[PDB]
Amino acid sequence: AVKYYTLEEIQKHNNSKSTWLILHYKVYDLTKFLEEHPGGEEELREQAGGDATENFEDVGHSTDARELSKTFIIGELHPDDR
Ligand code: HEM
């Protein structure tokens, strides 16, 4: 099965206890990854609650970074909001 989240609910996760963001229509919970991210935590916090696909691709993440990102997926963006 697959869990779908709306933009409305995703935007609520942008505080000190929860950081979610969207990449290629998939929703990632990066709350616990903030301090481990090689690119710093500020880059992630600034995009929290929204779509960071362009920023993610603009920096050009490696294959290893992309494989690791998969472990943080919690669902997808509801089709109605795409
Ligand atoms: C899905 C979660 C993400 C993962 C797993 C991740 C992982 C990593 C890793 C492993 C690196 C080291 C270099 C590489 O392997 O490419 C990196 C660098 C970086 N990341 Fe991320 N990243 C994620 C999301 C993002 C997002 C959303 C942004 C920006 C909005 C961002 C901005 C950067 C920057 C600025 C660097 C530094 C690149 C440089 O040294 O020029 N990352 N990230």
* CATH code of the domain containing 75: 3.10.120.10
Domain housing 61: 1-82
Q: For the stretch 5-42, what's the b/e string if a residue is b when 16 or more beta carbons lie within 10 angstroms of its beta carbon?
A: beeeebeebbeeeebbbbbeebbbebbebeeeeeeeee
Query: How many domains does the chain divide into?
Result: 1
DSSP per residue, 10-63 = HTT-EETTEEEEEETTEEEE-TTTTTT-TT-SHHHHHHTTSB-HHHHHHHT--H
Residues 6+ apart with CB under 8 A from 70: none
Residue 40 phi/psi, 5-degree rounding, is: 90, 165
- Asked if 71 contacts 41 with a C-beta cutoff of 8 angstroms, the reply is no
Asked if residue 20 has its Cβ within 6 Å of ligand 1, the reply is no
Question: Which experimental technique did the depositors report for determining this structure?
Answer: X-ray
What kind and span of H or E run contains 77? Answer: strand 73-77
Atom of ligand 1 nearest to the CA of 68: 5
Query: What residues are designated binding site for heme?
Result: 37, 61
**Cα dihedral sign for 5, 77, 68, 18?**
negative
Q: Report the distance separating Cα 19 and Cα 15, nearest Å.
A: 6
